[PDB]
């Protein structure tokens, strides 16, 4: 799967 | 310092679907950078392999600076990537205790043999 990471 | 466009791991304008295929069955720490799907929330998308899945990370460019979040303190995408080859991404997100280990290179071409 692809997951967009919260980098904040 | 080298330009983004010649960086082996920069693939420019390829799709999220193409990256999936490039990262299929790869080891943790395998990565490449492409242009963002859309335009209004980050210029580039770093995709890395972790736990058999793909982690997508926006790279921002504002006011002559680059980074993953404010404050942006890197001078180029190359400098940012190079920094995290030897430094874990954990300081941004607990799920990313991993380094940028193995670039998917656009120069690394394998030859299918014809008899």
From Swiss-Prot, chain B:
Summarize tissue expression: Isoform 2 is expressed in skeletal muscle and brain, and at lower levels in kidney and cardiac muscle. Isoform 2 and isoform 4 are present in skeletal muscle (at protein level).
Q: How is it modified after translation?
A: Polyubiquitinated in T-cells by CBLB; which does not promote proteasomal degradation but impairs association with CD28 and CD3Z upon T-cell activation. In adipose tissue, polyubiquitinated by the BCR(KBTBD2) E3 ubiquitin ligase complex; recognized by KBTBD2 through the SH2 domains, undergoes 'Lys-48'-linked polyubiquitination leading to its degradation.
Q: Which residues form the signal peptide?
A: none
User: The SH2 domain covers which part of the protein?
Assistant: 9-104
Complexes and interactors: Heterodimer of a regulatory subunit PIK3R1 and a p110 catalytic subunit (PIK3CA, PIK3CB or PIK3CD). Interacts (via SH2 domains) with CCDC88A/GIV (tyrosine-phosphorylated form); the interaction enables recruitment of PIK3R1 to the EGFR receptor, enhancing PI3K activity and cell migration. Interacts (via SH2 domain) with CSF1R (tyrosine phosphorylated). Interacts with PIK3R2; the interaction is dissociated in an insulin-dependent manner.
Task: Give the family this protein belongs to, as stated in its UniProt record.
Answer: Belongs to the PI3K p85 subunit family.
> What exactly does this protein do?
Binds to activated (phosphorylated) protein-Tyr kinases, through its SH2 domain, and acts as an adapter, mediating the association of the p110 catalytic unit to the plasma membrane. Necessary for the insulin-stimulated increase in glucose uptake and glycogen synthesis in insulin-sensitive tissues. Plays an important role in signaling in response to FGFR1, FGFR2, FGFR3, FGFR4, KITLG/SCF, KIT, PDGFRA and PDGFRB. Likewise, plays a role in ITGB2 signaling.
Q: What's said on domains?
A: The SH3 domain mediates the binding to CBLB, and to HIV-1 Nef.
Q: Which disease is it linked to?
A: Agammaglobulinemia 7, autosomal recessive: A primary immunodeficiency characterized by profoundly low or absent serum antibodies and low or absent circulating B-cells due to an early block of B-cell development. Affected individuals develop severe infections in the first years of life. SHORT syndrome: A rare, multisystem disease characterized by short stature, anomalies of the anterior chamber of the eye, characteristic facial features such as triangular facies, lack of facial fat, and hypoplastic nasal alae with overhanging columella, partial lipodystrophy, hernias, hyperextensibility, and delayed dentition. The clinical phenotype can include insulin resistance, nephrocalcinosis, and hearing deficits. Developmental milestones and cognition are normal.
Q: What is this protein called?
A: Phosphatidylinositol 3-kinase regulatory subunit alpha
Q: What organism, scientifically named, is this protein from?
A: Homo sapiens
Upper classification of the organism: Eukaryota, Metazoa, Chordata, Craniata, Vertebrata
Q: Which residues of the full protein are shown?
A: 325 to 439 of 724
């Amino acid at each position: 799967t692809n997951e967009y990471m919260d980098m904040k | 310092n080298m330009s983004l466009q010649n960086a082996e791991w920069y693939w420019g304008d390829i799709s999220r679907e193409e990256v999936n295929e490039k990262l299929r069955d790869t080891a943790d720490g395998t990565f490449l950078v492409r242009d963002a799907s859309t335009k209004m929330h980050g210029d580039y998308t770093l995709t890395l392999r972790k736990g058999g899945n793909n982690k997508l990370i926006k790279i921002f460019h504002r006011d002559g600076k680059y980074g993953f979040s404010d404050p942006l303190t890197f001078s180029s995408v190359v400098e940012l990537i190079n920094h995290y080859r030897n430094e874990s991404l954990a300081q941004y997100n607990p799920k990313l205790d991993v380094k940028l280990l193995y670039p998917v290179s656009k120069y690394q071409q394998d030859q299918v043999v014809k008899e």
